[PDB]
Design a protein around this ligand. Structure first.
Ligand SMILES: [Zn+2]
Ligand SMILES: [Zn+2]
Lengths: 403, 403
């Protein structure tokens, strides 16, 4: 009946936070996990530069062959290199893919006695307050360095790896995979194109709102989630209109992590469940799908359940702090909805599934399937109210019309 | 030029959070550091109860001879017992005194090669972003369990130990003393008398406000500080009027830790500097002294410096979020001041140094001394603007009249 709050014990941020790698104690062998993109932009060179500046010599190995939605094959390939190389630090540089991929290798590197076939079956129960295999004695430290703003994976214990010969998406639980250090350096976000600045920027906002109305929300996550929401409405338009705006980028990158610290402990809701499946089926970007769904999900969650429920009031708290009309809970909710629609328009994002290129026959033929899968999504468990599959169908249909 | 944010990697909270000690992995020998008060209330029995419920036998040693403002003699006495007992977990149960005392023993237990005479001279530079002696390989885990709401010491790396044959107060730096686990259980706060509920409750508010206008404030600490401020204005009156109010106690205990997470990284200001010396000289309780000074310190810090300064605007942000009139920065500031005066009155607290029993001759004879010492206080370094000793004299004089 108790609750817990967990984050990386050290988060370094502001520009050139990456320079900590020149100061970080007790590291002689670094295993860098990333993708070809970060290598292309010389971001890996940036990391290696500060390791060279250490008084003692540092041997480094690079693992760049990481694909979106990392597979087990990719993981075990990395583990094999790690076991021969034996790093005392693992540096995950990139988006959610290299982050989750690196976390997975870290697990099997530290626990050679672990089997993936076993992990496939055991599921993440978000009611549990202790890891079966927590961090006790590890041979390598884990440093997360996100390059988007963002997934906030640099503060979570969540690692997901796809199977391919099945294609089921498996979250890895029982093992504690929270990074030892998170380096939130905005210099890595400077180059992000504007249409994904908008996508990733709205996922941060979705993470924070969902974390705030989650049935796991607490005093510790509430303040962080609220702050994240504030920062997005303040600087995401600026970051979009001008990606050279250093202040706007610094704020969004922090908001991404702060939103992460909230949902790492409070989890999410059906918005991500609905977006997971909608985006995988029609190849719609994650944050783009979240924006289309948000107006309709908030209205559903705000609807007092058929009959202690507070989701409607909590949505109004966000409006009230945003300085929006919330004299009553009902209008406060709709104010928040309208603010999000305005923002979405500023970022030139679609506001319907139909606007994305999806037919109405292509959609109606898949809606029952996605609704059922969405319900099955782990994130549904933390939604302020457990929905019927029919509730998710209705939301999807409203989302197709748009708003 | 980078910044960092650090907290205990695991914070357990809500009622019966102490039950984690039955689940906490890899502990066979517990060294409990506390004071006679916690033993009297059976709080130590509560801790020992859950250690017994572990599958494996747990040998426990208790160290209760801890006095307010712990001395080095107390520390080295504890270390000697630890070295013979060899605990794999240290449990600090109590207020700031047993917490700081336990942290100090932990240092010398883990680092037998450390000298206090050496630590006396090296000072806490709050510009540094790496510990000279961080947590790498420790033979004992540190569990902090606060019983007041509170000092928030259960999340800081700050340990202070008095000398007596000198009586200089020495913060211990270079060594990383952040607890591995913080257990914020409101069952330990239920019995706190109401006049100290008010004192400790207002110190939380002082920690949060100072952390928010500190020159070290950042996106991560701002959200936490703001949340803390909200919780106090909402539940501190309730906690005062009725100490059996379980919700009010749970909220204040969380607010204490959340305020801690903010100032652990953002530090404080002259309010604590002024309160440290005022309280040590006239034996005025910490939070009681902070309340008398706050109206006058906020007005000073809000005053635009003689000539990027934002302290005035940030004070108004607190008023605005509190729903107070802040149409302009100037009135927003004064609104916050008035809200604090109202609160102080609800808690039946004094509003002047004279109201505490201090004469006007007893005061005027000491004011230069305290002002000079206040300036010298470490906390002054993080104040939004560096004050002259004369500025601190004026504040002290305004505080004597009251408001
Ligand atoms: Zn997301
Ligand atoms: Zn204090």
């Amino acid at each position: 009946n108790m609750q817990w709050f967990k984050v990386p014990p050290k988060i370094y941020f502001e520009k050139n936070a990456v320079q900590y790698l020149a100061k970080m104690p007790d590291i002689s062998r670094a295993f860098i996990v990333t993708d070809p993109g970060m290598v292309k932009l010389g971001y890996v060179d940036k990391v290696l530069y500060y390791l060279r500046r250490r008084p003692d010599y540092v041997h480094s190995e690079i693992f760049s062959e990481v694909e979106p939605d990392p597979s087990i094959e990719t993981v075990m390939k990395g583990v094999d290199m790690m076991r021969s190389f034996e790093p005392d630090v693992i540096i995950a540089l990139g988006g959610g893919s290299p982050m989750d991929a690196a976390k997975a290798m870290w697990l099997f590197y530290e626990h050679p006695t672990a089997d993936f076939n076993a992990l496939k079956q055991k599921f993440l129960d978000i009611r549990k307050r202790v890891y079966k295999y927590p961090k006790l004695g590890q041979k390598a430290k884990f440093v997360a360095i996100p390059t988007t703003s963002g997934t906030g994976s640099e503060v979570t214990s969540f690692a997901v790896i796809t199977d391919k010969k099945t294609n089921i998406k498996y979250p890895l639980a029982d093992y504690e995979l929270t990074p030892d250090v998170a380096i939130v350096d905005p210099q890595f976000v400077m180059t992000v194109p504007k249409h994904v600045t908008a996508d990733t920027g709205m996922d941060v906002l979705t993470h924070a709102i969902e974390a705030y109305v989650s049935n796991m929300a607490n005093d510790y996550t509430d303040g962080l989630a609220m702050k994240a929401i504030q920062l997005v409405f303040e600087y995401l338009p600026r970051a979009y209109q001008n990606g050279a705006d250093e202040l706007a980028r610094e704020k969004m990158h922090n908001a991404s992590t702060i939103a992460g610290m909230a949902f790492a402990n409070a989890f999410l809701g059906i918005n991500h469940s609905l977006a997971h499946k909608l985006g995988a089926e029609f190849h719609i970007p994650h944050g783009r799908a979240n924006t289309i769904l948000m107006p309709h999900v908030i209205r559903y969650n705000a609807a007092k359940p058929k009959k202690y429920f507070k989701a409607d009031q909590r949505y109004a708290e966000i409006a009230r702090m945003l300085g929006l009309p919330a004299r009553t809970t009902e209008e406060g909710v709709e104010s928040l909805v309208q603010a999000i629609i305005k923002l979405a328009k500023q970022l030139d994002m679609p506001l319907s599934i139909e606007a994305c290129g999806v037919s109405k026959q292509e959609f109606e033929s898949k809606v029952e399937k996605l609704a059922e899968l969405a319900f099955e999504d782990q994130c549904t468990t933390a939604n302020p109210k457990l929905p019927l599959v029919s509730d998710l169908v209705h939301i999807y249909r409203q989302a197709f019309k748009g708003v």
